[PDB]
Design an enzyme around this catalytic site. Structure first.
Site, PDB file in Angstrom:
ATOM      1  N   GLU A   1       6.487  60.087  74.428  1.00 24.36           N
ATOM      2  CA  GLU A   1       5.814  60.305  72.700  1.00 24.36           C
ATOM      3  C   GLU A   1       5.571  61.382  73.412  1.00 24.36           C
ATOM      4  OE1 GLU A   1       3.905  57.549  69.867  1.00 24.36           O
ATOM      5  OE2 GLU A   1       3.739  56.733  72.407  1.00 24.36           O
TER       6      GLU A   1
ATOM      7  N   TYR B   1       2.896  54.741  59.151  1.00 26.42           N
ATOM      8  CA  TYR B   1       4.561  54.607  58.156  1.00 26.42           C
ATOM      9  C   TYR B   1       4.650  54.032  56.565  1.00 26.42           C
ATOM     10  CZ  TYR B   1       5.415  57.019  62.663  1.00 26.42           C
ATOM     11  OH  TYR B   1       5.085  57.765  63.794  1.00 26.42           O
TER      12      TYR B   1
HETATM   13 MN   LIG Z   1       1.549  56.494  72.527  1.00 25.59          MN
HETATM   14 MN   LIG Z   2       2.902  56.344  68.837  1.00 21.51          MN
END
Ligand SMILES: [Mn+2]
Ligand SMILES: [Mn+2]
Ligand SMILES: [Mn+2]
Ligand SMILES: [Mn+2]
Lengths: 284, 284
Positions: free
Chosen positions: B154, B101
């Site tokens: 996630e 990022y």
């Molecule tokens: Mn992960």
């Molecule tokens: Mn991750």
């Protein structure tokens, strides 16, 4: 309070430098054509083959230790969030190191012989003593001693084992295995540098007296580990004429480990003379 | 007693399968030509740019959490030494995720705006509540709840953020950033699968009653996280017409997260309908 890491706000440029070096140096044992070493393996004596498996099961234990305990033990003591991230890379690469020895065994060796080498390593007193001493420091409450132990392990003690594939390489044998070992060394030279750098950074903030205590401790620990490693070397290299060369290689690397931590060399030239063919094998 | 890991004595084939998938899928953000997204970035509105930075600072927090706390929290609960090694890879790749990022920000964005987005994320109530809930479970003494939390994070919650680069990609914008995000997803789909698999393996050895308790807990946690994520979505996507599509994408991924854990889908088609262009962007 966890905060988002920001790699555009680096506090210590060395963290980014080392992140980049280690990650750009990513490798896996599958990338090395180890199977091409089969003919050379078949030219080794039974004693040489046994030695190779004992060396590598020993390194497997120690890299497993570095993955499971060593690198994680340094994480609570990080100075920066970026150092924490680099340590996650280091831990992962220790798993790659440990895994790579199994790649060598799978490709070249008979399972019965590999299992015998694993059992030999389990019962080897100096190997176990080394593992115990290093773990003791990793489990302790002194962050600085953990860094000393990690540097001594992989910038110094590992070289009793690393010597062997470098020797074979210098003789034109197990050249692919040597390439793999050079990848491990390429990592470990950087690990030792970085962990040693962080040790010195940590020391900047401790008292003059504690600095002196830590130097005396580092010396005590080096000497203890060194004497133990001489015994390990004697037992490993027993059926060969190579122990003296291995020991010289140990002293040569001990000096590098000390310098990683900011200390002067302890071993004189007379004790650290490495055969030029071995040094050439390290840097081809 | 640490023992040398032996990758030629695998106890669960899935460990080797996942080790191989994750390691062969290694990448770094430097491998993606993000700089080629500059022209597309310059075509976004100020509101769209602000949204993108807020989405990514949010994901940075959550990937940092996964690196520092999430993946390490699963290590003591591993069933096999090979799982421990895979977890070291997973932790390292979370650091790569978080780092990526910053790569996007460095390439495309103005520092003042990025810093504003970081501050916005620090003060955003639903983002902080999400982080707190997940951390609470990671810090707890229940190994099974840690795996539930990681999978929900996630394989489900991240998709409120992942939606955006997929949307841009479907419009022909930020295509390189989308490629990078697809690399993250390629990892996370496997992380969720593997952690969910291990959850089910752990459950094989617990009591029938505790299985029922854990299912009811998983439902409670999903609903709590879902309601919070709807609020986060509303606040993130406020100046756009996109909240409904994001929410449908959340429900679609919630079903996948549940299935990773061995549970039936909770969200009907009517709530999980994803624009075909978005699904195409995920799998080009
Ligand atoms: Mn992960
Ligand atoms: Mn991750
Ligand atoms: Mn290593
Ligand atoms: Mn190391």
């Amino acid at each position: 309070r966890i905060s988002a890491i920001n790699w555009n706000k680096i506090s210590d440029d060395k963290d980014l430098e080392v992140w980049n070096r280690l990650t750009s140096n990513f490798w896996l044992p599958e990338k090395v054509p180890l199977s091409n070493d089969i003919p050379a393996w078949q030219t080794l004596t039974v004693v040489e083959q046994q030695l190779t498996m004992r060396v590598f099961t020993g390194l497997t234990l120690l890299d497993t230790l570095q993955n499971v305990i060593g690198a994680p033990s340094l994480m609570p003591d990080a100075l920066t969030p970026h150092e924490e991230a680099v340590l996650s890379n280091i831990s992962f690469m220790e798993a790659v190191h440990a895994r790579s020895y199994s790649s060598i065994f799978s490709t070249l060796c008979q399972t019965k012989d590999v299992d015998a080498a694993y059992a030999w390593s389990e019962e080897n007193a100096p190997l176990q003593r080394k593992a115990q001493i290093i773990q003791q420091h990793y489990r302790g409450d002194d962050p600085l001693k953990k860094k000393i132990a990690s540097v001594f392990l992989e910038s110094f003690l590992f070289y009793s084992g690393f010597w062997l594939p470098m020797y074979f390489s210098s003789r034109g044998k197990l050249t692919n295995t040597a390439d793999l070992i050079r990848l491990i060394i390429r990592d470990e030279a950087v690990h030792g540098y970085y962990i040693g750098y962080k040790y010195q950074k940590n020391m900047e903030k401790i008292s003059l007296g504690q600095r002196e205590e830590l130097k005396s401790f580092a010396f005590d620990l080096l000497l203890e580990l060194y004497d133990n490693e001489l015994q390990y070397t004697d037992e490993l290299y027993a059926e060969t004429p190579w122990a003296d060369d291995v020991k010289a290689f140990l002293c040569y690397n001990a000096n590098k480990a000390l310098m990683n931590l900011g200390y002067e060399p302890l071993f004189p030239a007379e004790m650290a003379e490495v055969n030029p063919a071995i040094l050439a094998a390290l840097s081809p």
